Design an enzyme around this catalytic site. Structure first.
Site, mmCIF file in Angstrom:
data_model
loop_
_atom_site.group_PDB
_atom_site.id
_atom_site.type_symbol
_atom_site.label_atom_id
_atom_site.label_comp_id
_atom_site.label_asym_id
_atom_site.label_seq_id
_atom_site.Cartn_x
_atom_site.Cartn_y
_atom_site.Cartn_z
ATOM 1 N N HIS A 40 47.180 40.591 33.212
ATOM 2 C CA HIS A 40 47.942 39.641 34.006
ATOM 3 C C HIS A 40 47.618 38.176 33.651
ATOM 4 C CE1 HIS A 40 44.771 38.868 37.417
ATOM 5 N NE2 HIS A 40 45.486 37.780 37.343
ATOM 6 N N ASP A 84 45.040 46.764 34.028
ATOM 7 C CA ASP A 84 45.029 45.311 33.882
ATOM 8 C C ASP A 84 43.884 44.873 32.918
ATOM 9 O OD1 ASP A 84 45.567 42.557 34.428
ATOM 10 O OD2 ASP A 84 44.684 42.578 36.377
ATOM 11 N N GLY A 175 41.866 32.267 39.762
ATOM 12 C CA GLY A 175 41.162 31.441 38.807
ATOM 13 C C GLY A 175 39.989 32.222 38.203
ATOM 14 N N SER A 177 40.220 35.477 37.772
ATOM 15 C CA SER A 177 40.912 36.573 37.103
ATOM 16 C C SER A 177 40.644 36.651 35.614
ATOM 17 C CB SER A 177 42.407 36.417 37.329
ATOM 18 O OG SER A 177 42.684 36.264 38.706
ATOM 19 N N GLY A 178 40.467 37.854 35.101
ATOM 20 C CA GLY A 178 40.143 38.079 33.694
ATOM 21 C C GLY A 178 38.623 38.057 33.480
#
Ligand SMILES: [Ca+2]
Length: 223
Positions: A40, A84, A175, A177-178
Protein backbone atom coordinates in the site's frame (compact mmCIF):
# COMPACT_ATOMS: atom_id res chain seq x y z
CA UNK A 1 4.32 6.05 16.68
CA UNK A 2 1.83 6.96 19.50
CA UNK A 3 3.10 6.55 23.09
CA UNK A 4 6.70 5.62 22.16
CA UNK A 5 10.13 7.09 22.85
CA UNK A 6 12.82 8.74 20.71
CA UNK A 7 15.02 5.86 19.38
CA UNK A 8 18.31 7.73 19.43
CA UNK A 9 20.22 8.55 16.28
CA UNK A 10 20.99 5.50 14.24
CA UNK A 11 20.09 2.98 16.91
CA UNK A 12 17.72 1.20 14.40
CA UNK A 13 20.18 0.88 11.41
CA UNK A 14 17.95 -1.08 9.07
CA UNK A 15 15.09 1.59 9.11
CA UNK A 16 14.68 3.43 5.76
CA UNK A 17 12.48 6.43 4.85
CA UNK A 18 10.72 6.30 1.45
CA UNK A 19 10.73 9.80 0.01
CA UNK A 20 8.93 11.15 -3.12
CA UNK A 21 9.59 14.86 -2.27
CA UNK A 22 8.55 14.24 1.33
CA UNK A 23 8.65 11.20 3.69
CA UNK A 24 5.58 9.02 3.05
CA UNK A 25 6.34 5.47 4.42
CA UNK A 26 8.91 3.39 6.24
CA UNK A 27 10.78 0.33 5.01
CA UNK A 28 13.48 -2.09 6.16
CA UNK A 29 16.86 -2.72 4.59
CA UNK A 30 17.23 -6.50 4.00
CA UNK A 31 20.56 -6.52 2.12
CA UNK A 32 22.75 -3.84 0.48
CA UNK A 33 20.42 -3.53 -2.55
CA UNK A 34 16.88 -4.47 -1.42
CA UNK A 35 14.28 -2.83 0.85
CA UNK A 36 11.02 -4.50 1.99
CA UNK A 37 7.97 -2.20 2.63
CA UNK A 38 4.14 -2.37 2.46
CA UNK A 39 2.43 -2.81 -0.99
CA UNK A 40 0.00 0.00 0.00
CA UNK A 41 3.04 2.37 0.10
CA UNK A 42 3.58 1.79 -3.67
CA UNK A 43 4.12 4.76 -5.97
CA UNK A 44 6.48 5.72 -8.82
CA UNK A 45 9.56 7.98 -8.18
CA UNK A 46 10.69 6.56 -4.83
CA UNK A 47 14.02 7.67 -3.35
CA UNK A 48 15.23 5.48 -0.48
CA UNK A 49 16.74 7.38 2.44
CA UNK A 50 19.06 5.29 4.65
CA UNK A 51 20.96 6.35 7.81
CA UNK A 52 18.33 8.86 8.82
CA UNK A 53 17.46 10.24 12.15
CA UNK A 54 16.07 13.76 11.70
CA UNK A 55 14.44 13.46 8.17
CA UNK A 56 14.45 17.27 7.89
CA UNK A 57 18.18 17.85 8.70
CA UNK A 58 21.25 16.32 6.82
CA UNK A 59 23.21 15.12 9.85
CA UNK A 60 26.00 13.24 8.06
CA UNK A 61 25.01 9.52 8.05
CA UNK A 62 22.55 9.55 5.19
CA UNK A 63 22.66 7.63 1.95
CA UNK A 64 19.96 8.71 -0.59
CA UNK A 65 19.56 6.13 -3.35
CA UNK A 66 16.82 5.91 -6.03
CA UNK A 67 14.76 2.80 -6.51
CA UNK A 68 15.36 0.91 -9.86
CA UNK A 69 12.23 -1.30 -9.60
CA UNK A 70 9.31 -2.05 -7.20
CA UNK A 71 7.57 -5.38 -7.09
CA UNK A 72 4.26 -5.52 -5.30
CA UNK A 73 3.29 -8.98 -4.04
CA UNK A 74 1.52 -11.02 -6.80
CA UNK A 75 -1.62 -11.35 -4.59
CA UNK A 76 -1.86 -7.93 -3.02
CA UNK A 77 -5.48 -6.97 -2.43
CA UNK A 78 -5.85 -3.26 -1.67
CA UNK A 79 -9.38 -3.59 -0.45
CA UNK A 80 -8.52 -6.19 2.24
CA UNK A 81 -4.80 -5.35 2.60
CA UNK A 82 -4.07 -9.08 2.42
CA UNK A 83 -0.48 -9.62 1.27
CA UNK A 84 0.50 -6.04 1.99
CA UNK A 85 4.24 -6.41 1.13
CA UNK A 86 6.48 -5.02 -1.66
CA UNK A 87 10.20 -5.20 -2.55
CA UNK A 88 12.17 -2.23 -3.80
CA UNK A 89 15.55 -2.79 -5.51
CA UNK A 90 17.98 0.18 -5.14
CA UNK A 91 19.77 1.53 -8.16
CA UNK A 92 23.18 1.12 -6.35
CA UNK A 93 24.15 -0.93 -3.32
CA UNK A 94 24.09 0.87 0.01
CA UNK A 95 27.44 1.07 1.94
CA UNK A 96 26.84 -0.93 5.11
CA UNK A 97 28.52 0.07 8.44
CA UNK A 98 27.24 0.14 12.16
CA UNK A 99 24.68 2.94 11.47
CA UNK A 100 23.39 1.55 8.14
CA UNK A 101 22.90 -2.21 8.40
CA UNK A 102 20.49 -4.90 7.09
CA UNK A 103 18.03 -6.91 9.25
CA UNK A 104 17.73 -10.68 8.90
CA UNK A 105 14.66 -12.38 7.56
CA UNK A 106 13.06 -14.86 10.05
CA UNK A 107 13.47 -18.62 9.96
CA UNK A 108 10.38 -19.14 12.13
CA UNK A 109 7.25 -17.19 12.82
CA UNK A 110 7.29 -15.44 16.12
CA UNK A 111 4.65 -16.43 18.71
CA UNK A 112 2.12 -14.39 20.66
CA UNK A 113 3.86 -13.07 23.79
CA UNK A 114 7.17 -12.14 21.97
CA UNK A 115 8.14 -8.52 22.57
CA UNK A 116 9.15 -6.62 19.41
CA UNK A 117 10.57 -3.14 18.46
CA UNK A 118 8.41 -1.01 16.06
CA UNK A 119 9.78 2.29 14.66
CA UNK A 120 9.05 5.11 12.23
CA UNK A 121 8.35 8.80 11.62
CA UNK A 122 4.53 8.54 11.62
CA UNK A 123 1.96 10.56 13.55
CA UNK A 124 2.41 10.65 17.34
CA UNK A 125 -1.14 11.60 18.39
CA UNK A 126 -4.33 9.49 18.63
CA UNK A 127 -6.67 12.45 17.78
CA UNK A 128 -4.95 15.36 16.05
CA UNK A 129 -1.63 15.38 14.22
CA UNK A 130 2.04 15.93 15.06
CA UNK A 131 4.69 14.40 12.93
CA UNK A 132 8.14 13.97 14.49
CA UNK A 133 11.29 14.87 12.70
CA UNK A 134 13.41 12.20 14.52
CA UNK A 135 12.84 8.47 14.67
CA UNK A 136 10.38 7.14 17.31
CA UNK A 137 10.39 3.61 18.78
CA UNK A 138 7.84 1.39 20.58
CA UNK A 139 8.30 -1.99 22.31
CA UNK A 140 5.08 -4.02 21.89
CA UNK A 141 4.06 -7.76 22.27
CA UNK A 142 2.61 -9.89 19.50
CA UNK A 143 -0.97 -10.64 20.48
CA UNK A 144 -2.71 -13.98 20.16
CA UNK A 145 -4.66 -14.81 16.97
CA UNK A 146 -7.84 -14.94 19.06
CA UNK A 147 -7.33 -11.43 20.52
CA UNK A 148 -6.55 -10.10 16.98
CA UNK A 149 -9.63 -11.69 15.29
CA UNK A 150 -11.97 -10.75 18.16
CA UNK A 151 -10.71 -7.15 17.73
CA UNK A 152 -11.19 -7.18 13.91
CA UNK A 153 -13.93 -9.74 13.11
CA UNK A 154 -13.93 -10.91 9.51
CA UNK A 155 -10.78 -8.85 8.67
CA UNK A 156 -7.65 -10.76 9.85
CA UNK A 157 -6.17 -13.31 7.34
CA UNK A 158 -3.37 -15.83 8.01
CA UNK A 159 -0.89 -13.23 6.55
CA UNK A 160 -1.63 -10.74 9.31
CA UNK A 161 -0.92 -10.52 13.02
CA UNK A 162 -1.74 -7.98 15.73
CA UNK A 163 0.80 -6.39 18.08
CA UNK A 164 0.32 -3.72 20.68
CA UNK A 165 -1.97 -3.11 23.63
CA UNK A 166 -5.74 -3.68 23.82
CA UNK A 167 -5.93 -0.87 26.43
CA UNK A 168 -4.72 1.50 23.70
CA UNK A 169 -2.40 4.45 24.21
CA UNK A 170 0.55 2.94 22.31
CA UNK A 171 0.60 1.95 18.62
CA UNK A 172 2.11 2.69 15.22
CA UNK A 173 0.05 5.15 13.08
CA UNK A 174 -0.16 6.83 9.62
CA UNK A 175 3.32 7.53 8.28
CA UNK A 176 4.74 4.43 10.02
CA UNK A 177 3.30 2.22 7.25
CA UNK A 178 5.80 -0.03 5.45
CA UNK A 179 8.13 0.10 8.53
CA UNK A 180 9.71 -2.74 10.63
CA UNK A 181 8.47 -4.91 13.48
CA UNK A 182 11.68 -6.64 14.70
CA UNK A 183 11.59 -9.48 17.28
CA UNK A 184 14.81 -11.21 18.51
CA UNK A 185 16.81 -9.55 15.76
CA UNK A 186 14.54 -10.84 12.95
CA UNK A 187 12.10 -8.85 10.82
CA UNK A 188 8.71 -10.40 11.65
CA UNK A 189 6.21 -7.65 10.64
CA UNK A 190 5.58 -4.67 8.37
CA UNK A 191 3.33 -1.80 9.68
CA UNK A 192 0.15 -2.25 7.61
CA UNK A 193 -3.15 -1.03 9.01
CA UNK A 194 -5.44 -0.54 12.10
CA UNK A 195 -8.58 1.44 13.01
CA UNK A 196 -7.32 4.93 13.94
CA UNK A 197 -4.20 4.84 16.13
CA UNK A 198 -3.75 3.84 19.77
CA UNK A 199 -7.51 3.17 20.31
CA UNK A 200 -8.93 0.84 22.94
CA UNK A 201 -9.38 -2.65 21.51
CA UNK A 202 -8.01 -1.59 18.12
CA UNK A 203 -4.34 -2.80 18.03
CA UNK A 204 -2.08 -2.37 14.94
CA UNK A 205 -2.21 -5.10 12.23
CA UNK A 206 1.01 -6.16 10.60
CA UNK A 207 1.97 -8.22 7.57
CA UNK A 208 3.34 -11.61 8.77
CA UNK A 209 6.78 -11.60 7.03
CA UNK A 210 7.58 -15.29 7.85
CA UNK A 211 4.91 -16.35 5.32
CA UNK A 212 6.77 -14.48 2.49
CA UNK A 213 10.33 -15.56 3.01
CA UNK A 214 10.46 -17.91 -0.04
CA UNK A 215 8.86 -15.23 -2.27
CA UNK A 216 11.45 -12.63 -1.04
CA UNK A 217 14.39 -14.97 -1.54
CA UNK A 218 13.27 -16.10 -5.02
CA UNK A 219 12.49 -12.55 -6.21
CA UNK A 220 15.89 -11.20 -5.05
CA UNK A 221 17.63 -14.16 -6.69
CA UNK A 222 16.26 -13.32 -10.17
CA UNK A 223 16.05 -9.54 -10.23
CA1 LIG B 1 18.65 13.67 8.21
Amino acid sequence: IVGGYTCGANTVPYQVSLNSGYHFCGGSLINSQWVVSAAHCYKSGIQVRLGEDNINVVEGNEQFISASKSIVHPSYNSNTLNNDIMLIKLKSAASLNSRVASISLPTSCASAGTQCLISGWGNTKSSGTSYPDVLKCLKAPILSDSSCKSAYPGQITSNMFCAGYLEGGKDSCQGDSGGPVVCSGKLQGIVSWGSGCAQKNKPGVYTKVCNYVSWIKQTIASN
